RNA sequence: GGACCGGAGUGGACGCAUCACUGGUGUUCGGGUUGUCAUGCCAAUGGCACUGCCCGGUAGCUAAAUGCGGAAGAGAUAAGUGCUGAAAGCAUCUAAGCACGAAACUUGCCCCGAGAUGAGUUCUCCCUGACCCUUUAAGGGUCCUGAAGGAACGUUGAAGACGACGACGUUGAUAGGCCGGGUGUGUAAGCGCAGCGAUGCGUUGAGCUAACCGGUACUAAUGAACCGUGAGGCUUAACCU
RNA sequence: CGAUGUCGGCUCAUCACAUCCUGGGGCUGAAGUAGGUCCCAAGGGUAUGGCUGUUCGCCAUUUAAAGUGGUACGCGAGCUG
RNA sequence: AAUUCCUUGUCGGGUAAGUUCCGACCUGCACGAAUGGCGUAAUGAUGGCCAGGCUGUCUCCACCCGAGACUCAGUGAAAU
RNA sequence: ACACAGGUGGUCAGGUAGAGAAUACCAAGGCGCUUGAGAGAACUCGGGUGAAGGAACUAGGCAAAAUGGUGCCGUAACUUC
């Protein structure tokens, strides 16, 4: 139909060499309560870097 | 000596009393200083190396910084290197602008293009459109035919293929000059230049002519 | 190919565009803080500062320009009466945008969009 | 545009309306005729008070046109419509001994300077 | 970097007149015609309002004998005697293209004289 | 009727680029307009009728607007045209010996080019701690202590499918707002006055402002650690050691 | 003979030269100016209308230029039918 | 000519030319009256020819706004 | 087979616009329809605007465009009147 031949593990495989990428970019932690976030991202106490934020 | 750096700053008229208007280009010199003159010894020609403006210290990294400190504290925009004609040079104190061209006609100018991602083809390579009204079955642009005959089974290199398009040279090699001012880096050119107002270019005198 | 841009495209039509923003900024001048997607809530950064920017005004000409362009029920007169006032020394600078993460379960950026100064 | 097949006006003295240019000329072909083109024209008409015979075939020279004129200048100097005048074969300038029309002084060229040489408003 | 805004306006004049379109100027210009320099008098309504720095061109429509007539002059070229601002017009538009439309009594502009 | 030369005059075919010549397009701008619903009513403002309809157009773009050449020199040949001369006393363009010369060949002109791993040349910048273990050009572990630089975090574009890449993240200018400039449109939107009223006159050469670009601290643009360390394999003659 | 689409065109290219047109040289039955003709030379280059569904072939306009050939007398997993 | 092959036979008309189109000619290869003739008003998803009108079909392309594609996250095929 | 761009007989008939149970906007009344958010590439499907000429396109004005309605005035060849 439209193909010759079954494709091989290294065919189908070539995809996973491009992996090397760190998760999540090893986060950021808050260093007035201990809990982790996003870079820039609002912790789970309407806190960001020692300062109340959001309406809650 | 050297090709020359400067900056596309506007379009601007210049009259004549016969009655035509003359629409011409406003250039700016930033000028080129001496950094290193070059012994016979090395390659096989007499050479010089320029450096160009001045830039804020918060930009240039150590590497290029220490070499703009070896002759002094503008810095920045990199290097160039030229051969030498017709003359022996030196280094201490020197510097060229738009003088260069207190005796020349012509000049031939070097700068980049516009930014236009994978560009197709209609506009790149000129492939012709075709039918929208009468036949032409899902086919209102097709992209040439990459394969002079179904026998061979093969595409040649001697053909073009849509692909990333601008951030490269252009150039204009035969280009009037019209006037020059060695107080103000004026360099005004006949006509149109590649590129819009704020683009960085290179000029030279012209060759072909 | 677009050569260039100052305010973005967006998904649905220009219609729906004029009568969303105009209800999100007459929303967001009725609850001071709203919370939706980032490059939308920069769009409508774009819309409710040129309406403060009015809101300081009395001429007869001004005071009541284009009504039913922007139209509220509840707060046509709170608008003049503090709201244009709170920023009318300022020149710019009337909200944040308080860029953060998600809205659903996967990370679309997210603006939690306020005005510089509150009520309560 | 004027081109082969095209009614072209004539501000030539009792030339007629209804005319017809057949061919564009001045050396390797150019498509499309403007002030200075010289072309193969017919008369479709003639007219009574006339001087050239119906289904005719003789030269003409272009003078007036919708385009415009801008080369000698950079500024656009635009007339109404298009017209043009009957020009000899071998004898030199136009058969046109009164000639329509204000035209411009820019119209001084050698081969065809008889028309700013006759009764023009410029 | 200086000369950013400056080369595109020295060769501009310092008093030049803000007529507007439907206003009639009275242009003055000489031409050399390969033998010796004479002086031309042009007249007609004015159909935009010439507003582009250096780069003005200004379109003046004549329509008073014979067909059509239209010229195009530069704002700030040398070659010019005398440009003045000679009549009103009473223009509720922009552009007078519109005139490429109208003959007789309804092609004239009018001052309004108040 | 009436050539070639290298050197000028002026056009055709073609392409690429400019937006400054003029024109066009232009649903972030202004004016005009038909009908009806909503905003209680009015003065009016909005929704719906493809962007309802027609008239101009900033910014952006663009061809019909506009510019320009594919040349000389240099090197060296082929076809050809020839010299001087031996084999062949002479003769002979050829053998020995030497020339000139083509829309061709190589440069010269423009671009890319060292994975050219044939990894070339030349210059700038940074890192100067020590132990532990094995059957070890393999590595593995930890303490002491971290550079030049790159990414990420971002604000964003004239850079772009996504990546990538220029700009900016404070002795301040990346994007926005706010201001000021500069274009566009065409005389606020109310209030008087003229009139039988559609409408006109006065305030008003007005109003409104966005993309072009000059301001401004007003809003936004983390601390830092992971990658990259602690001087980096071998040898010859001479010197240092 | 278990797919082995048909005429011409639209369409986009590439090789040959027993060179059409361009560059160089000659023979000449070549006075200028052009032809007639062939030795070299492949870097580049060669019709718009009218009739036919057309290619063929005839007529208008007529050549810087409407040469001859190969690639299914190229050219349907592009298009037209 | 839905009828005559080479045949665009033969004379003319219009054309810029015209196997197209029209007026005609008539030793019609293989016109001919109810397996109808010949023709006329009205008539037709009417063939061809000529012109006017308007037109992005074309000359020859250029711009604007919608929905996908492209990025993310949920859901996720077949001939062979 | 499907929360299927399909099919399925009549009755009742408020205001403005219009001749009209065509058709523009709404009342009374009902619906808000089962992937979503960004980006604003080639390449397509669904729309809008084009200056000069002009059917030169094509077998062919195909398609698209202008025109488009109403009442009066006015209206040729030929005719079975």
Request: aromatic share 6%; net charge positive; charged share 25%.
């Given at each position: 139909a439209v193909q010759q031949n079954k494709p091989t593990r290294s065919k189908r495989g070539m995809r996973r060499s491009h992996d090397a990428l760190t998760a999540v970019t090893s986060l950021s932690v808050d260093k007035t309560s201990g809990e982790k976030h996003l870079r820039h991202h609002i912790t789970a106490d309407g806190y960001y870097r020692g300062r109340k934020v959001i309406a809650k | 000596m050297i090709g020359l750096v400067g900056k596309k700053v506007g379009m601007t008229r210049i009259f004549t009393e016969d009655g035509v208007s003359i629409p011409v280009t406003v250039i700016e010199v930033e000028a080129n200083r001496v950094t290193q003159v070059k012994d016979l010894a090395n390659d096989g020609y007499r050479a010089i190396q320029v450096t160009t403006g001045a830039k804020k210290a918060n930009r240039v990294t150590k590497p290029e910084a220490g070499?703009?400190?070896?002759?002094?504290?503008?810095?920045?925009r990199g290097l160039w290197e030229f051969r030498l004609a017709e003359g022996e040079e030196f280094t201490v104190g020197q510097s060229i602008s738009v003088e260069l061209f207190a005796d020349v006609k012509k000049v031939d100018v070097t700068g980049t293009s516009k930014g236009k991602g994978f560009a197709g083809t209609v506009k790149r390579w000129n492939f012709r459109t075709q039918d929208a009204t009468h036949g032409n079955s899902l086919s209102h642009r097709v992209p040439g035919s990459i394969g002079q005959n179904q026998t061979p089974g093969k595409v040649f290199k001697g053909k073009k293929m849509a692909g990333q398009m601008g951030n490269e040279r252009v150039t204009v090699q035969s280009l009037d000059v019209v006037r020059v001012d060695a107080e103000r880096n004026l360099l005004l050119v006949k006509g149109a230049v590649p590129g819009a107002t704020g683009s960085d270019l290179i000029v030279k005198p012209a060759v072909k002519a | 190919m677009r050569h260039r841009k100052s305010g973005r495209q967006l998904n649905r039509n220009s219609s729906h565009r004029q009568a969303m923003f105009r209800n999100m900024a007459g929303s967001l001048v009725r609850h001071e803080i709203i919370k939706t997607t980032?490059?939308?809530?920069?769009?409508?950064?774009?819309?409710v500062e040129p309406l403060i920017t009015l809101a300081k005004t009395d001429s007869v000409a001004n005071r009541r320009l284009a009504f039913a362009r922007t139209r509220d029920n509840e707060i046509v007169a709170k608008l003049f009466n503090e709201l244009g006032p709170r920023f009318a020394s300022r020149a710019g600078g009337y909200t944040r945008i308080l860029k953060c993460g998600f809205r659903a379960g996967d990370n679309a950026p997210m603006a939690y969009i306020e005005l510089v100064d509150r009520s309560e | 545009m004027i081109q082969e097949q095209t009614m072209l006006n004539v501000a030539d003295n009792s030339g007629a309306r209804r005319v017809m240019?057949?061919?564009?000329?001045?050396?390797?072909?150019?498509?499309?005729?403007?002030?200075?083109?010289?072309?193969?024209?017919?008369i479709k008409e003639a007219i009574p008070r006339g001087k050239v015979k119906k289904g005719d075939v003789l030269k003409a020279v272009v003078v007036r046109t919708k385009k415009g004129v801008r080369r000698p200048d950079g500024s656009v100097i635009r007339?109404?419509?298009?017209?043009?005048?009957?020009?000899?074969?071998?004898?030199?300038?136009?058969?046109?001994?009164?000639?329509?029309?204000?035209?411009?002084?820019?119209?001084?060229?050698?081969?065809?300077?008889?028309?700013?040489?006759?009764?023009?408003?410029? | 970097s200086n000369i950013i805004k400056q080369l595109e306006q020295e060769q501009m004049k310092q008093d030049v007149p803000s007529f507007r379109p439907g206003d009639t100027v009275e242009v003055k210009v000489w031409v050399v015609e390969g033998s010796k320099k004479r002086?031309?008098?042009?007249?007609?309504?004015?159909?935009?309002?010439?507003?582009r720095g250096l780069h003005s061109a200004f379109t003046v429509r004549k329509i008073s004998n014979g067909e059509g007539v239209?010229?195009?002059?530069?704002?700030?070229?040398?070659?010019?005697?005398?440009?003045?601002?000679?009549?009103?017009?009473?223009?509720?538009?922009?552009?007078?293209?519109?005139?490429?439309?109208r003959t007789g009594k309804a092609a004239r502009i009018k001052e309004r004289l108040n």
């Open positions: - | 070499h703009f400190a070896k002759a002094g504290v503008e810095a920045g | 980032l490059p939308k809530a920069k769009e409508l950064r774009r819309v | 240019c057949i061919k564009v000329l001045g050396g390797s072909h150019r498509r499309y005729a403007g002030v200075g083109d010289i072309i193969k024209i017919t007339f109404d419509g298009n017209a043009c005048v009957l020009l000899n074969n071998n004898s030199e300038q136009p058969i046109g001994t009164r000639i329509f029309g204000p035209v411009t002084r820019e119209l001084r060229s050698e081969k065809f300077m008889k028309i700013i040489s006759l009764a023009p408003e410029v | 002086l031309q008098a042009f007249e007609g309504v004015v159909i935009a309002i010439r507003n239209e010229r195009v002059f530069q704002t700030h070229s040398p070659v010019v005697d005398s440009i003045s601002v000679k009549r009103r017009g009473a223009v509720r538009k922009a552009k007078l293209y519109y005139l490429r439309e």
